[PDB]
Design a protein around this ligand. Structure first.
Ligand SMILES: O=[N+]([O-])/N=C1\NCCN1Cc1ccc(Cl)nc1
Ligand SMILES: O=[N+]([O-])/N=C1\NCCN1Cc1ccc(Cl)nc1
Ligand SMILES: O=[N+]([O-])/N=C1\NCCN1Cc1ccc(Cl)nc1
Ligand SMILES: O=[N+]([O-])/N=C1\NCCN1Cc1ccc(Cl)nc1
Lengths: 208, 212, 211, 212, 211
């Protein structure tokens, strides 16, 4: 038991403290994103901002984070501070305030080199809630992707194209009629290369 | 005089603890840990019916114990405990599951360690969480619930326990806008899409209502 | 040119005091007394839909440490210095009923004297639990908030006051609120959770809309 | 395999640039620098007529080129550019001259450095600035303006250029409370009382009105 | 060439900051005069439900340290450079009646000149204690706020102004409020804590609604 601690000490150390500069064209990366929507907190129709609370599942895999669990006392994974590893700069493209982080910044690293990171967020973004008081509700959309890596450096994937609604707050002012998450491709004025985003479409209405 | 000596003893202990074998990497399946959580509810500051957020101020008592923090008192001039900045040691990642704003810390981040390896930490906090206050202006009032638990450690790494099911109300602000009808704290199990492993929370349930 | 010396004398004084030895805060074996006093500058806002009131004040904090003494003759005849608060231990004095983190309004800089005595006067803005009922009347409203160490009991940190009158002499003469009285009282209690004494200084303020 | 080689190649280059001859100390009259700026306006979020403040969301393409940042790709695995944290390199101190709050940064602080030593950095921001929204509720709309430029570097040390004088509006939020009649960005010169030497800014003028 | 100018700048910066480490601030034996001049950009809001007013302004700060002198000849004819304000000591100039932490609007970069003189001009937003009554009248309202070192007596930091007129030449022409006048005047203050006097510059602004 004092042994196992020492094994993990040794592996963090081997991993971090002696031997990654982000993805490149030669060494591209695939980040998988899934959203879990917890609450539409507020719809401000005097500014067309909507605040959402959700979490965002991120998963990716680095060869430099691999190890053999036999060399390390059968450790298959460990938890770690997100600052000790590279994380992807997944950004919402139409936010109107800096994202508020609601969960501790810790990730999970597995022996095959995959990393899982699940930050919870409050986000204000651009959305006209006209018709939220109608049957068909209002429809808002926000794109998420790397701000600086093109699609030849960071690819994006979803496991499914439904947002996760299974922990949506049942007593929220808004109900969700539908929530999808879909990969897309864009070009930006700066650059030849296309950029990848995952677009959250959310349809919602005042609970009544 | 012996003042200088007890000062040296404490610095020596601290450095024996921290700068030898060091910083403990958190709990694992092989080395699990039980955190005892307890809440002291001070005030429901605000209940916003247009967003269904409620704002609470409370102290969250966290208690755990690590082998790596044991020492013998007679070896350090009979020091039985000490205060230390929370940045100095490992602390658990206890998170409200339905917050809507980051938590605002109202007390200094200092814990107490005791020779037997236990640690105490009582952050005071202000939390906004998801809560529909319908009914708060009635006799029955309203009821809300928010879970607390590690965000990244399953039940096999961090288990949670309470000392009692009853929220401490003996410091509840007597002139709050809202009075407290009941407030309990009960351990639960949850599952999350990412993982087969069970996650543990303490669910805080508060029934409250406008003061007359 | 005496001015390069004075300056080296001071830097040397810093080294010798900071990285030599080293202070871990107070203990049962080596307790400390902190003198506090409040200077109330303004009641800024009284919100009666949430029962919070915002104060602006600064707090005089004084204490004395042996680890902090020096002979001035060995250091240029330097008798005192200004130093960043991050460089020295400071007491963890907290309000016990805040509703928002305190916002800090003055430099975190303290003054250290050769006898080990330290002086520090943080100016702060505080929201705390307070029902302003009756500010709009002649008797006014009463509020209270205690301050004390959050983690040290009276066996490690003792508080004293010089007066039980809050200093109102720089109170803002055009506040939305007049002060009718403002007192600060040392209190000792036991919380039978635990057998050792606890000390706080209870700020009691009486106030009404300015007329 | 070569994936590990290309990784090592980058590690090497970054090291080679970033510790020697390290932190290049900014532009000087002997060694001035040109920054090209272009704005992409996304949204007018709020126009407050009780305080005369307007809140914009935009991003700002910034480009410049340093000698100290050149390299031969052939000497580095044919690496022709790389992403890097904005803190590891000098970046220009372009500020809004009439903001009323600190700018909130919306995008990560990361830049792209090419082998000829050109750098590109595109921070997205939320700005409150001095603007009388009078007229916004009419056909004619309101006109506002905000100068951007170095705070401390005169036009002998930093020049500004634009590629076009038209703000890019192809990402303007289509259902904003405000529509854009026109948005231009124009290089200007200015003096301040501190200093004899003129300074450069790029003036963002926007004409806009409530959508109907 | 430009390789040499950079070489030289880098050498010089290394010499001041390293080579003779970090300057302990001013003392009774090494005192310091800071010149201050305000430029008022905008009165943004005047809140009469709390008597707070928000100003946007910049504050010109000059002082001179002997330990910042160099001979431009040893150093490639570099007469000045810009530098991050964290690489150097700066004065802790603080508003005495602020009700919020000051928000900084400009980058924190100073200019250092070879005679050892430093210019630093931070832009800020400030909320301070001010009763805006009369603002809608012809006479307008009048508010004042004091600025100066929070911890250094006049024997360590003295202040002076170049003129008693606040610079209005950049006042925002479409502000909710016009300025009828604006002065800055050096004063000498005594606090309870201290025998020694503290110096401050008093900002008196008289203002009203635009019409
Ligand atoms: O021209 N662009 O707008 N580019 C752009 N907009 C949003 C993200 N993005 C790509 C980008 C590319 C390079 C850098 Cl330094 N930043 C951003
Ligand atoms: O899919 N999940 O929501 N997982 C999850 N939600 C709250 C806590 N939790 C488990 C978890 C597991 C691993 C990481 Cl890296 N983050 C979070
Ligand atoms: O006299 N000034 O107002 N100068 C000035 N105002 C805005 C930008 N600027 C130039 C300047 C020059 C030097 C320093 Cl340290 N700061 C600012
Ligand atoms: O007794 N005082 O209020 N002193 C005081 N108030 C505002 C500034 N000032 C001087 C001072 C002197 C020393 C320390 Cl540590 N802080 C402040």
């Amino acid at each position: 038991k004092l042994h196992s601690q020492a094994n993990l000490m040794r592996l963090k150390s081997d991993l971090f403290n002696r031997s990654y500069p982000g993805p490149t064209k030669d060494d591209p990366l695939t980040v998988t994103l899934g959203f879990t929507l917890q609450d539409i907190v507020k719809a401000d129709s005097s500014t067309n901002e909507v605040d959402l609370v959700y979490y965002e599942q991120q998963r990716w895999k680095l060869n430099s984070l691999m190890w053999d669990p036999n060399e390390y006392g059968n450790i298959t994974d460990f938890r770690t501070s997100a600052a000790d590893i590279w994380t992807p700069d997944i950004t919402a493209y139409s936010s109107t305030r800096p994202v508020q982080v609601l969960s501790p910044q810790i990730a999970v690293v597995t022996h095959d080199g995959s990393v899982m990171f699940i930050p919870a967020q409050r986000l204000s973004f651009m959305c006209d809630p006209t018709g939220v008081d109608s049957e068909e509700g209002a429809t808002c959309a926000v794109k998420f992707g790397s701000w600086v890596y093109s699609g030849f450096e960071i690819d994006l994937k979803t496991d499914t194209d439904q947002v996760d609604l299974s922990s949506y707050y049942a007593s929220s002012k808004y109900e969700i009629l539908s929530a999808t998450q879909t990969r897309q491709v864009q070009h930006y004025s700066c650059c030849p290369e296309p950029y990848i985003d995952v677009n959250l479409v959310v349809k919602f209405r005042e609970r009544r």
